[PDB]
Amino acid sequence: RSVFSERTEESSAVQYFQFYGYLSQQQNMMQDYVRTGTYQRAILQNHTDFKDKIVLDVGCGSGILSFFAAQAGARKIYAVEASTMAQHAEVLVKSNNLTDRIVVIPGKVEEVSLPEQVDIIISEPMGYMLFNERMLESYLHAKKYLKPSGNMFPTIGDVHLAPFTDEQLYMEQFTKANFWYQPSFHGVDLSALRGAAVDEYFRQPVVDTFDIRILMAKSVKYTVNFLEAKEGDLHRIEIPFKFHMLHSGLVHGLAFWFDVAFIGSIMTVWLSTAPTEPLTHWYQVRCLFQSPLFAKAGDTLSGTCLLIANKRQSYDISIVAQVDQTGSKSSNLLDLKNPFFR
Amino acid sequence: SVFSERTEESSAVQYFQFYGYLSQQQNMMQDYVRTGTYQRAILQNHTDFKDKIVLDVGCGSGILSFFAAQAGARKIYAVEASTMAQHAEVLVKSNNLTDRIVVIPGKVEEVSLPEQVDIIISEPMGYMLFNERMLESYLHAKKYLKPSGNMFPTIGDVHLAPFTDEQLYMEQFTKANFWYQPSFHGVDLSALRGAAVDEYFRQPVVDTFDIRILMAKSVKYTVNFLEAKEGDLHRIEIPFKFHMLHSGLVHGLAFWFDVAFIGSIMTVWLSTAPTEPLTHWYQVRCLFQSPLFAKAGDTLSGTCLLIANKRQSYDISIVAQVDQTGSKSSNLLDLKNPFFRYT
Amino acid sequence: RSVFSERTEESSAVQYFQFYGYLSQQQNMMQDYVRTGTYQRAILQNHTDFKDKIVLDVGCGSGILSFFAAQAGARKIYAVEASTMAQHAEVLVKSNNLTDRIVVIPGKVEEVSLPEQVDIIISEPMGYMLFNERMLESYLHAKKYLKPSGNMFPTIGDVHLAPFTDEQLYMEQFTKANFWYQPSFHGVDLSALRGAAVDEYFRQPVVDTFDIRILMAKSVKYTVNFLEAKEGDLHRIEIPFKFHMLHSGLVHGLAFWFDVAFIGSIMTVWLSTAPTEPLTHWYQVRCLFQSPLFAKAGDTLSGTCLLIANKRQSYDISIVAQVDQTGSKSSNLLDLKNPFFRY
Amino acid sequence: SVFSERTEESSAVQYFQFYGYLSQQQNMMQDYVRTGTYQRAILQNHTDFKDKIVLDVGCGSGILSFFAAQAGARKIYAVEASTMAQHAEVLVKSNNLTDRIVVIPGKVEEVSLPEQVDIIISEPMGYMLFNERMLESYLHAKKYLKPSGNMFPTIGDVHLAPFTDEQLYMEQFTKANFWYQPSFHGVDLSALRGAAVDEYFRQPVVDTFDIRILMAKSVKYTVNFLEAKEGDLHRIEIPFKFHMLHSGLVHGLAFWFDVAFIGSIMTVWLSTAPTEPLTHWYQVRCLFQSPLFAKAGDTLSGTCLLIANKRQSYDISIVAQVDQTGSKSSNLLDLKNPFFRYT
Ligand SMILES: COC(=O)c1cc(O)c2cc(NC(=O)NCCCCNC(=N)NCC[C@H]3O[C@@H](n4cnc5c(N)ncnc54)[C@H](O)[C@@H]3O)ccc2c1
Ligand SMILES: COC(=O)c1cc(O)c2cc(NC(=O)NCCCCNC(=N)NCC[C@H]3O[C@@H](n4cnc5c(N)ncnc54)[C@H](O)[C@@H]3O)ccc2c1
Ligand SMILES: COC(=O)c1cc(O)c2cc(NC(=O)NCCCCNC(=N)NCC[C@H]3O[C@@H](n4cnc5c(N)ncnc54)[C@H](O)[C@@H]3O)ccc2c1
Ligand SMILES: COC(=O)c1cc(O)c2cc(NC(=O)NCCCCNC(=N)NCC[C@H]3O[C@@H](n4cnc5c(N)ncnc54)[C@H](O)[C@@H]3O)ccc2c1
């Protein structure tokens, strides 16, 4: 009956919260120094946004952001967490002698009761490609607990798209699919499945990093203002794009990354997963075209990236792109729920 | 159905989604030991298939059914519960075998077969042989087997042996000691160190390793698929008494398995032992919480108890002791959540 | 009509003899020092096979082999050539003061008149893969002028086949065809032609050289004895093969090269185009499989290479190969008339 | 037919075999200047195609017919004489355009068209514009053109200019001097040196080059395809009077061409000039066998005479003189046998 369960299949949720119940996954996220250090800087350098304030930490995990809020002077922090990690967060609150200031509240943020409205919401809601996990909907849902002029850390998110050329990545995924081109694998003709194999492989977003030299145009930016967005905004995300090509060659797909900003009273602090910046546990994401497009420097590559949220806490991706000057058109569907970790 | 009574829905959804991918089929088909040995077992025992009725349990892409067709089978019922069943259909059509291979979507515990069969073929083995609890579906399928029908594979041998791997043992604490710092960005994490150690030690380690870490001849626990019942696999008690061949510290038990295709013409073996080329089953190792010192000639005795759970896997309870000294160790592990260490 | 024209399309012959009418092509063949030096050695070191003998030079071109025969003491050499190069040969015979000994006879060797029978035939009848050009049939046809005791230089030819692995060559030809995979080339769906494009590209034998590292088994040898063969023997050439694989991996096709032997009275001299030998203007030839075959070291790769002569002075190639242990079968057709020059 | 009267069978067979290959279509399609400019010319002049009847002469894969369809043509007759016609048919089906594009196999001089057309489109240009004598087929097709009708391309400009390239000139003799040796394996080849020089100089050099080798503003010879008759192209006389911008030795004449698509909305140009990005037409250079010294301000005058031959090409006769000194040079070249020097 909760907003969460209406939009989420049980089996997806079971797996999701089992995964985040493990201390090893917490360690993996916490040891990303860019991630953890930038969150600490954003909070501590904006200490006036926390001094004597009431805070909500959405999906707190081990509790680390709540401890930063306490270091910054927060009067009271409600730390909401739906996995079994909530019990471990409690252990740390006791052992850091902060029971008077951090209150763990087990459950889904769409389902728990909070005793009061809060001045500021903090969270790490970003998934791969920003939107994976559909955790941004829970962060926005939590605004029901935000006082009128309250703040959100992070405050905004920028998704960046850019066209890329990477023949080796293309031929790797292409070579895999041509396994099913074989007419006599131990005497068995597999070729009738070649098309279905190519489809399956090229639907997989490629999660890994890459040199910026593969980017063929300045990135296009789609911005979510978390102070203003509603959950429903994220069920169907339409991102138009028009790229002015800076290099001639084959376009093998689009690359995705994101930035978020903590717009504080004292300063704005940015956390970037761009390929120009040190690697993070978010890496970067690339959606391959099944057939590359040829473009000349100075051509425009235009189209639309459509993200449709699904009940597996992820998105179906539709990318339609064309070279305006020639009319070369490519349409592509990808399943962010089955990424290829390269 | 028998399947749903013993399986959580959420476990089954994930399980069959995973096997719905062609890439996972390709990963299994590319294992030359796995695919080549199944082909040899069937083709070299052609009299067990000529003009016979066959059941392929969990046929995936259909590959074992095609081998049965190459061997002269009159009719093959290929049962598959994932969406891979539709791809198997495509291949049957394109290999012009619709008159001989019938794909039947669904669980073998739930579908109807028109006919009793002469031989069941399947690949029911998981990690440590028993993971996935697919062996129960393979045995369940015997309700369709004619009296004196055969099973391919016919038996399975799970092998246990003690191992020494100081680096693997110490790696657990190096990972857990992440939590043993008093000011991680100002936060004392040390209260969680013990919980982290516990969590790493509950995970069996899927990996391969050099046979020089093995400290005694393996002990063998055998399932004869012609004779076993599903119920035999709900509680699997494997006693062991190891005569130690080397002195040193024993850090846990290593697992692998063999299966045999006992045909009329010959018996063909498929081995995942560490003395053999690697397979997609690798090997499995379960650590003790505290190592045991043993001398060459001592005996290390105890039991490995595998208790089936509703997550298509087993809870593993290992108790071991050095008889000559009384040094005792145990561990509890969740086979459903293995740690993939191979690189 | 003559034997040549009944087996040859006019349009093929016009082009063929126009090509050989050019001095630049003569230079290209003559500057191959292996080719020219070995022909000279074969003749001069077997001088007794030429001293005071009557010689026929089939397809003499510029006349070089006739001049070697004259250096070796031949009484008379009939130099037959069907291209306009016959007129340049004439010039050289007069400029080298050998008119009393070398008699150029313009025309096809299947059509000209020789005044007498000869003691020995010399020629360079080898094309790419030995058989291209169907010049070997003209060389054998010329035996009608050979005395009972007569000899032939070259005397025999060995064609060698061996399996090879060359992922980069395969992906190169494969990448070219996938141009026609495009669903919107300037708005035009080309993909319905993809299959026809792959066929066309993989029908092309690849002429170039390569490191012997890529060979996966000892070569198999097919021998033509020019003293004994008849023209008809070369209309349908069937080369069985059974390779014992020395390395595991993908087999992307078969590699071809040849040797010829000049079996003289004094010694036998060999001319090899093997990839273990210095490059010649014959290079080597490779026939790709559209789908490579996986084989293990110790497997056997067996099948047949079938060469069917066509009216374009070349051969349709059929290669059927299978990995005996798995039954993986590959069938391939190639047009030797349309080679891909990669060097 | 008009085609067979003017074309030797053997030339045509080879010509249409070459264009039968998808790889040659792909090579022409990948030339972005060629394909992009044709697309722009048609699409930007859409009013010349909307609901119109179109004839595509020598359509190959059909690409220009698809551009005409993108531009709204009611009906397109796509004529192609090679086997590529069958592949065009496949693409028309798979692009769901059978109601609008009709592929007609055969020579445009021999096929029937059911009706007159509003506009003819073709790519009739060969090297130096005229090679292949395809322009005569394009003009021949005007019998199907309505009185009002247009042609895409509408005109062609051939450009000639004098060039200096000492290294290109000397390269001829370096190659020929292979023959100038008195004992090549004992054989005096030198009598053929002059024949070799002649043969190299008869070949037009297909290559690109830096515009700084040009020594005078080009002279332009124009063919208006709306007005020319086939017979106009049997004997093409191009007078020239160059006003030399640089002093030096003139080693020959360089050739290139432009065509214009004169539409109702705009005129679009396709240039193969050396100042423009390279195309698969490159540029062509015809050497003089003796260079001419000229000073800046001198005039180099003469005639380039192109005589069509039955090999779908031209015999080229260039006669040039420096008016101020009387220094004359002649040259006879065969456009059918170009030398491809580009690397
Ligand atoms: C086999 O292939 C596949 O199927 C697959 C697909 C993937 O994509 C895979 C991806 C992986 N790794 C990955 O993504 N790493 C990068 C993580 C970026 C940072 N994520 C982050 N902090 N988000 C929020 C999380 C925290 O918020 C809590 N929470 C959520 N909702 C809540 C609610 N309603 N109330 C309260 N608490 C709630 C959670 O419990 C938790 O503590 C691994 C494996 C993958 C496998
Ligand atoms: C996040 O951590 C985790 O949670 C986790 C845990 C693991 O352990 C993970 C392990 C993996 N890899 C692995 O295991 N590799 C080794 C494979 C060995 C060979 N397996 C085999 N052939 N067995 C049988 C399967 C076939 O039988 C069908 N079938 C089953 N019942 C049926 C029924 N009732 N009717 C009809 N058809 C039925 C299935 O649909 C399928 O076609 C990867 C990821 C893993 C993740
Ligand atoms: C893809 O595009 C394509 O279509 C193509 C296909 C090719 O394959 C291409 C191949 C090329 N080059 C090549 O292969 N070079 C290496 C071979 C040299 C060694 N061969 C050799 N000496 N044979 C004998 C030749 C001499 O014997 C004469 N002759 C023949 N019969 C006669 C008769 N009945 N009476 C009298 N005289 C006769 C001839 O006139 C001549 O003087 C180039 C371009 C190619 C193009
Ligand atoms: C033997 O080896 C050597 O010595 C040689 C000599 C050369 O010179 C060599 C030259 C080459 N390369 C080259 O020339 N590149 C320049 C690009 C030209 C671009 N223009 C273009 N596409 N031509 C238009 C023709 C198209 O119209 C069709 N058609 C013709 N008439 C038709 C009719 N009556 N009805 C119907 N259809 C007809 C044809 O089938 C075809 O589709 C390569 C290799 C060469 C080799």
Query: Residue B73: which CATH number?
Result: 3.40.50.150
Which residue CA neighbors atom 28 of ligand 4 most closely?
D58
Count helices and strands (H / E) in chain C. 9, 16
The encoded tokens of residue C197 equal 């494009």
Q: Going by DSSP bridges, is the β-strand pair B145-152/B117-122 parallel, antiparallel, or unpaired?
A: parallel
Q: CB distance D185–C36 less than 8 Å?
A: yes
Q: List phi, psi (to 5°) of A301.
A: -110, 110
DSSP bridge partners of B242: B300
Pair (A72, A107) in one structural domain: yes
- Residues whose CB is less than 8 angstroms from the CB of residue C333 and which lie 6 or more positions away in sequence, other chains included: C203, C316, C317, C318, C319
Residues of C in contact with D29 (CB under 8 A): 185
Conformational region of residue C227, where left means phi above 0, alpha means psi within -120 to 50, and beta covers everything else: alpha
**Quick check: helix, strand or coil at residue B260?**
strand
Of A96, A189, A193, the CB nearest to B22: A193
Please count the structural domains in chain D.
Answer: 2
Pair (A299, A169) in one structural domain: yes
Ligand 3 atom at minimal distance to the Cα of residue C83: 40
Neighbours of D318 (CB within 10 A): 22
C135 in ligand 3 pocket by Cβ < 6 Å?
Answer: yes
d(CA B278, CA B325) in angstroms, rounded, equals 37
Pair (A147, A175) in one structural domain: no
| Amino acid identity at C326 | T
Pair (D177, D126) in one structural domain: no
Buried b (16+ CB within 10 A) or exposed e, C73-85: ebebbbbbbbbeb
Whether the CA torsion A32, A35, A39, A42 is positive or negative: it is positive
Domain boundary among B156, B175, B205: B156
Q: Specify the residue for token string 């007794």.
A: C48
d(CA D154, CA D267) in angstroms, rounded, equals 9
Resolution for the entry shown, Å:
2.2
Interrupted after residues, chain D (C–N over 2.5 Å): none
In angstroms and rounded to an integer, the radius of gyration of the C-alpha atoms of chain D is 22
Pair (C40, C80) in one structural domain: yes
The encoded tokens of residue B273 equal 């032992």
Q: CA neighbours within 13 Å on the CB side: how many for C203?
A: 16
B126 in ligand 2 pocket by Cβ < 6 Å?
Answer: yes
**Quick check: helix, strand or coil at residue D286?**
strand
d(CA C330, CA D182) in angstroms, rounded, equals 54
Of C37, C179, C191, the CB nearest to D26: C179
CA dihedral B121, B124, B129, B135 (to 10 degrees): -100
The encoded tokens of residue A176 equal 């895999």
D80 in ligand 4 pocket by Cβ < 6 Å?
Answer: yes
Q: List phi, psi (to 5°) of A47.
A: -65, -30
Pair (D282, D258) in one structural domain: yes
Shortest CA distance to D186 belongs to which of C122, C126, C43? C43
Q: Are C98 and C104 in contact (CB under 8 A)?
A: no
Which residue CA neighbors atom 23 of ligand 4 most closely?
D124
- Residues whose CB is less than 8 angstroms from the CB of residue B269 and which lie 6 or more positions away in sequence, other chains included: B37, B258, B259, B260, B261
Mutate to test the pocket of ligand 3, among C57, C130, C135 (most ligand atoms within 8 A of CB): C135
Query: Residue C194: which CATH number?
Result: 2.70.160.11
Pair (D93, D213) in one structural domain: no
The encoded tokens of residue D298 equal 């001198």
DSSP-derived letter for residue B113 is P
Pair (B142, B241) in one structural domain: no
DSSP string, C292-338: EEEE-TT-EEEEEEEEEEETTTEEEEEEEEEETTTTEEEEEEEETTS
DSSP bridge partners of C156: C225, C261
| Distance to chain B for C294, nearest Cα, Å | 10
Note down the domain range covering A300.
Answer: 158-341
Buried b (16+ CB within 10 A) or exposed e, C286-319: bbbbbbbbbbeeebebebebbbebbebbbbbbbb
Pair (A208, A314) in one structural domain: yes
Q: CB distance C326–B36 less than 8 Å?
A: yes
Q: Are D190 and D179 in contact (CB under 8 A)?
A: yes
Tell me which of B32, B38, B44 to substitute to probe the interface with C (most C C-beta atoms closer than 10 Å): B32
Neighbours of C51 (CB within 10 A): 11
d(CA C143, CA C120) in angstroms, rounded, equals 9
Of A182, A186, A328, the CB nearest to C186: A328
d(CA D245, CA C55) in angstroms, rounded, equals 62
Domain boundary among A157, A187, A210: A157
Pair (B194, B68) in one structural domain: no
Pair (D15, D56) in one structural domain: yes
d(CA C60, CA C104) in angstroms, rounded, equals 9
Q: How far apart are the first and last CA of chain B?
A: 40
Q: List phi, psi (to 5°) of C134.
A: 55, 30
Burial class (CB in 10 A: 0-12, 13-18, 19+), A266: exposed
Residue spans of alpha helices (H) in chain B: 2-5, 9-18, 22-29, 32-43, 63-70, 84-94, 134-140, 166-176, 193-201
Neighbours of A113 (CB within 10 A): 6
Ligand 4 center to residue B58 CA distance, Å?
A: 57
The encoded tokens of residue B152 equal 């391919």
Tell me which of A15, A29, A31, A188 to substitute to probe the interface with B (most B C-beta atoms closer than 10 Å): A188
Q: How far, in Å, are A138, A218, A254, A260, B140 from residue A272 at the CA level?
A: 22, 16, 18, 7, 54
d(CA B128, CA B143) in angstroms, rounded, equals 26
Chains touching B (3+ CB pairs < 8 Å): A, C
Domain boundary among D156, D172, D187: D156
Angle at CA of residue D150, ends D146 and D154, nearest 5°:
145
Residues from C in contact with A at Cβ < 8 Å: 171, 175, 178, 181-187, 291, 293, 322, 326-330
DSSP string, C179-234: GGG-S-BTTB--GGGHHHHHHHHHTS-EEE---GGGB-S--EEEEEETTT--GGGG
Tell me which of A250, A294, A323, A326 to substitute to probe the interface with D (most D C-beta atoms closer than 10 Å): A326
**What experiment produced this structure?**
X-ray
Ligand in nearest proximity to the CA of C22: 3
CA dihedral D313, D59, D220, D254 (to 10 degrees): -50
Q: Are D330 and D343 in contact (CB under 8 A)?
A: no
- Residues whose CB is less than 8 angstroms from the CB of residue B5 and which lie 6 or more positions away in sequence, other chains included: none
The encoded tokens of residue B221 equal 């626990």
DSSP string, D131-166: TTSHHHHHHHGGGGEEEEEEEES-EEEEEEEEE--H
Ligand in nearest proximity to the CA of D284: 4
Pair (C115, C226) in one structural domain: no
Residues from A in contact with C at Cβ < 8 Å: 171, 174-175, 181-187, 291, 293, 322, 326-330
Burial class (CB in 10 A: 0-12, 13-18, 19+), B106: middle
Neighbours of C276 (CB within 10 A): 8
Buried b (16+ CB within 10 A) or exposed e, A20-40: bbbbeebbebbeeebbbebbb
The encoded tokens of residue C31 equal 């500057």
d(CA C203, CA B43) in angstroms, rounded, equals 34
Q: Going by DSSP bridges, is the β-strand pair D235-243/D299-309 parallel, antiparallel, or unpaired?
A: antiparallel
